[PDB]
Structures are given as structure tokens and as C-alpha cells.
Amino acid sequence: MIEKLRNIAIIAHVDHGKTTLVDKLLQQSGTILAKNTAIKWNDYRINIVDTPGHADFGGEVERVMSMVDSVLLVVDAFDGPMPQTRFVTKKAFAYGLKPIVVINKVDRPGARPDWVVDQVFDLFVNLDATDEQLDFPIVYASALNGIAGLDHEDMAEDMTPLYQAIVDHVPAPDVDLDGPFQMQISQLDYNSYVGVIGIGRIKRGKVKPNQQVTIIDSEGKTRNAKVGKVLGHLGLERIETDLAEAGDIVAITGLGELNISDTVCDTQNVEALPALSVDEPTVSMFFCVNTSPFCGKEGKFVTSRQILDRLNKELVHNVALRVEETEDADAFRVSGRGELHLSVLIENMRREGFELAVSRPKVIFREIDGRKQEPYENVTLDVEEQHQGSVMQALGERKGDLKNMNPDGKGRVRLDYVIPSRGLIGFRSEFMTMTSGTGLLYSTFSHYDDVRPGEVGQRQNGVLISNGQGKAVAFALFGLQDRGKLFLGHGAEVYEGQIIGIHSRSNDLTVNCLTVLVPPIRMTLEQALEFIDDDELVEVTPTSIRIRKRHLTENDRRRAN
């Protein structure tokens, strides 16, 4: 009784048809997407909660997973599952959800249902439980036709098989209807007429308008309020309801400025629901002021405790990152998920008009049970077979453990590896030019395990360091090619300590370029950032980043050796 409820989330890569699919389920029932679509189908109430784009480090995904009891993975019948929906799927498994895989667009010519089944199944290499991987039902669809079926040759005349699968395989909400009222805010919304809107799935009890209630946050603070309106979902809309009970995904009004993870409880029996997720950062990196003599050249405006507050602004757009204070009052220890995470932060921190010095990314070590541990992660690589012998030995040098390989049959091959983040850092740069830029690479954090004894091979080559400040002349640069490749041509402005090229030998060579050329080496942010040794820093400015030593003079460098 009152358990005909099906709270399910939906995951789909762009243009894989999740808007069309949900739309068909709506029009064929008794009732861009909406955040939640309520569907009445034969006295069943199915809530389809939407998942955000592949780039949402705010932590909305895990909030969504906290409201649903299953997830709906929509996959193109030809393209198969995309690595963009990787993490959203990962978090679904992390919340112990058993997925329902919908392979739609089955009507397109060359659709390979059998193949995309394997791909999805293999994609569940997300340390996914047997329970999750075994018996995930496969509903084939053609959303643009409104047709579904358990087989793709044998298809129903409507979306009935999909409805049935949802009813059959999605568990009812694990809630008690008779307990005292309890509801955690999962998402927020606003209406200039209604005010702040709190959205979530009622964990316990019931709620009516004008009900007296107590709000308790994650730390333990409490405040009393009276709910104004209880908005239930019906279609793509929200209507005022006189009663909402456990299991219902509803919207509440007039509780003031609700914060996410606040728990709305009956005035007595105030019980805060546990704060849910946190993506522990695995890669640390230093953000420093531009100590360089080019302090305010192109960099619009930055002092010490200026960009610091910007490192207190990105702190809620993402909780996978941390920001700590270093002894150097002009440098800060900011950590994150991967290197790509901290990378793009800079990329339009640059377009934001900033200038900063940044070290090389290092993995965050953790000591557990006396044994130090480092982050390992799963890597899938898609290269041409002319590169497979090359990229294999490369990862092997980076302490990569081979787990699986699968030839394309058409000249390519997909490789799978278990590798510590330590050895994977800055490999994307080497990888691309190694595979001539046709190869592809994807990564996903797996687990912390005992550190692999040893270190990753260092840069081997030394660097050409400028001894003074001035304009680089063609007469000197031509003589420098006798000892390696350089980073600029005639006319470029350089200072002392700045690295201008790559030494042919292993040692650092202090050279002057002040007293026609071969094409200079231009490095992108990530390409350069993978070139950096522990005694160096990248200097980033809104038009182009440059490279330098930590200690600018040759006198200071000798002391630190």
C-alpha cells in the first residue's frame, strides 16, 4: 500500500535521447528536461530525476543519487556508452544503485545492440558489485518512435516494456510512512513569488502546508519555521498539494534560506540525515604569486591575499578541491580530483585576468594502518596498433599494470591499466605526440593501496636558463641550437631565471641570448606543466604562459645543491 513509487535517476550522454525518451514516457501514460519528471502509469508513480552535464563538480550528482533507488542509463545503439558519463555512473554505483540500461536509437542503420551491451558491461569495470553488474535489465528503445522492447528484433508497439522494467527492477523507497517527518534538502530552487524552494525525497513521515517544523544542518544547529506550501510534482510542473508523505519527491516553500544537506524534521524528534558525499582530492598543486620580474606585465591584478579569496570562491563550485595555507604567505596548497581538474581552473583563471606561479602536480599520500598509501586509478587507452607496442612499455615504466587488451579488428586496440596517479601525471602530453594525436585516453580514480616502491623517471634532459633580462637576438639563438632546442625566436623579451630551451645534455646550462632560426617550440599549459621539475614553476598570464626556475639566479641555485 502506497508503495507504487519508483524514484529513478537518468543518465545519458549528450544527444543520446534522454529528453525524447522521458517525453515519450510522459505522453504515453495516465498523467531540455525538467529536473524531475513525475509520471503516473497504471496507479504507479514514477519519478525520473535528471542528472547534470558531465562537468558538475558542485556535487549535484551525488545529491540526485541520494533521492533515487535506481538509475536509468540511456545508451546510443551505435556509438555505445561515452566516457563522459563515466563519473555520473560511478557515483550511482557508489550509492549502491542497480542500473537499468536503455539502448535506444535502435532504429538507426548499423545499430549494434549486441556490441553496445558488451561495451556497457565492460564499462561497469567501475569496481561495480556483482549484484549491480549481474541482472541489469536491457530495454531496447527507439524513443523517436515511442517504441520499446526486451528484444530489439521483437519490439512492442509502445513504451510498455520500459515501464514494466522500471516497475520490476527498481526498488520502492526505503522509507517509513508512519515515523515523524524527516526530509533532507537535496537541491534548491527559487521563485520571486514563492521564495527559496527546498527539494528532496521525504525520508520519513508526512507534510502538509502551515505545518510547524524544525530545520537542522550538518553541524547541529537548529531553527524553527512553518512550511508555507508543499509542492508535489506532476508532469514537468509543480502544483500545490495538501499532503506529501514519505517517498514523495516534493518541493517545500517558506522555510527561509534552506541550505543543501539541511534536514527538515518534526519539531520533536529532530534527527539530521547524514551529510552524504565528499570527493577526496588526490592531486595537490601550489598556486603562488608571480615573483617573476614580470610582476604586472600582462597580469591584470594579483597580490598575495587577492587570488586567495578566489581560492575561497571556487570552494563551493567544487568540494573535490581543498585550499590550505602554506608558510609562504604568497603561495597556497590547493588539491583536487585529477590534474585536468586543477588545469582548466587556471585556463580561465587566466581568461579571468590573473597572473600566478604554479608548481608541478603531486599526488596526496595518505598513511593508513602504518602503511603509507597512494591513489591508484583505472586507465583505458584507445590507440592504433602501430602504437600499442610503444604505449605499453611507456606505461610499464610508469609503474602501470596491464589488465586487459581488446583489438578493434579495424586497426585499433583498447588497453586497460591499473596505475598509480603518481605515474600517470603528465602522461597525456607524451601520449598524444607518441600516438601522433590519434590515440585517446580516459582515467578514473579507483582506490588507495600500498605505495609502489620506486619513483617515476625524471625529465632526463636539462634546461637552458637565461642569465639576464633583455630581447633575444637571432645571432645568439642560432648558436644555441648547437646545444638543444629553444622556445622562442628573434625579438622575444626574456628575464633572468627564465628557461628558454631544452638542453641536449642532462645538466642545467645557464646561457645568454642577448649578445635564420629553426621553428621555436610552443608549449600549451598542460604540455609545459608536464615538463616541469620540482625546482621549477610555471608562470601563467592571460595571453600566454612562460617558464622559469624557482631560484632565478645561478648563485641561489648552486646553494640548493
Ligand X SMILES: Nc1nc2c(ncn2[C@@H]2O[C@H](COP(=O)(O)OP(=O)(O)O)[C@@H](O)[C@H]2O)c(=O)[nH]1
Q: Cβ closer to ligand X: 108 or 317?
A: 108
Q: Cβ closer to ligand X: 16 or 238?
A: 16
Q: Compute the C-alpha angle 328/329/332, nearest 5°.
A: 75
Q: What SS3 class is residue 174?
A: coil
Q: Are 287 and 349 in contact (CB under 8 A)?
A: no
CB of 142 to ligand X, least distance (A): 4
Which cell goes with 213? Answer: 517544523
Task: State the residue for C-alpha cell 639563438.
Answer: 477
CB of 31 to ligand X, least distance (A): 19
Smallest Cα–Cα separation from 532: which of 304, 390, 361? 361
Q: Residue 502: count other Cβ atoms within 10 Å of its Cβ.
A: 17
The residue number with the shortest CB distance to ligand X is 19
Q: Cβ closer to ligand X: 16 or 203?
A: 16
CB of 150 to ligand X, least distance (A): 16
| Residues near 425 by beta carbon (within 8 Å), at least 6 away in sequence | 283, 339, 360, 361, 362, 363, 456, 530
Q: What SS3 class is residue 23?
A: helix
CB of 411 to ligand X, least distance (A): 28
Q: Is 15 annotated as a binding residue?
A: yes
CA–CA separation, 162 and 184 (whole Å): 30
Q: Is 18 annotated as a binding residue?
A: yes
Q: Cβ closer to ligand X: 147 or 540?
A: 147
Q: Cβ closer to ligand X: 14 or 127?
A: 14
The region that residue 60 occupies, defined by phi over 0 for left and psi between -120 and 50 for alpha, beta otherwise, is alpha
CB of 25 to ligand X, least distance (A): 12
Q: Is 290 annotated as a binding residue?
A: no
CB of 284 to ligand X, least distance (A): 35
Q: Is 105 annotated as a binding residue?
A: yes
Q: Is 543 annotated as a binding residue?
A: no
Q: Cβ closer to ligand X: 73 or 143?
A: 143
Q: What SS3 class is residue 309?
A: helix
Q: Is 282 annotated as a binding residue?
A: no
Q: Is 106 annotated as a binding residue?
A: yes
Smallest Cα–Cα separation from 308: which of 295, 289, 336? 289
Q: Is 256 annotated as a binding residue?
A: no
CB of 50 to ligand X, least distance (A): 9
Q: Is 38 annotated as a binding residue?
A: no
Q: What is the DSSP string of 338-350?
A: SHHHHHHHHHTTT
Q: Cβ closer to ligand X: 141 or 289?
A: 141
| Residues near 397 by beta carbon (within 8 Å), at least 6 away in sequence | 457
Q: Is 142 annotated as a binding residue?
A: yes
Q: Cβ closer to ligand X: 13 or 387?
A: 13
Which residues contribute to the site for ligand X (CB under 6 A)?
Answer: 12, 14-20, 104-105, 107-108, 142-144
Q: Is 19 annotated as a binding residue?
A: yes
Which cell goes with 418? Answer: 591499473
Q: Cβ closer to ligand X: 12 or 345?
A: 12
Q: Cβ closer to ligand X: 39 or 346?
A: 39
CB of 55 to ligand X, least distance (A): 15
Q: Are 331 and 384 in contact (CB under 8 A)?
A: no
CB of 169 to ligand X, least distance (A): 22
Q: What SS3 class is residue 248?
A: coil
Task: State the residue for C-alpha cell 568540494.
Answer: 319
CB of 11 to ligand X, least distance (A): 10
Which cell goes with 387? Answer: 602504437
Cα-Cα-Cα-Cα dihedral of 18, 24, 27, 33, to 10°?
10
Please name every residue paired with 447 in a beta bridge, in sequence order, or none if there are none.
Answer: 376
| Residues near 533 by beta carbon (within 8 Å), at least 6 away in sequence | 360, 458, 459
CB of 118 to ligand X, least distance (A): 20
Q: Cβ closer to ligand X: 101 or 207?
A: 101
What are the helix (H) ranges across 134-242?
160-169
Q: What SS3 class is residue 133?
A: helix
Task: State the residue for C-alpha cell 609502489.
Answer: 452
Burial class (CB in 10 A: 0-12, 13-18, 19+), 379: buried
Binding residues for GTP: 15-20, 104-107, 142-144
Binding residues: 15-20, 104-107, 142-144
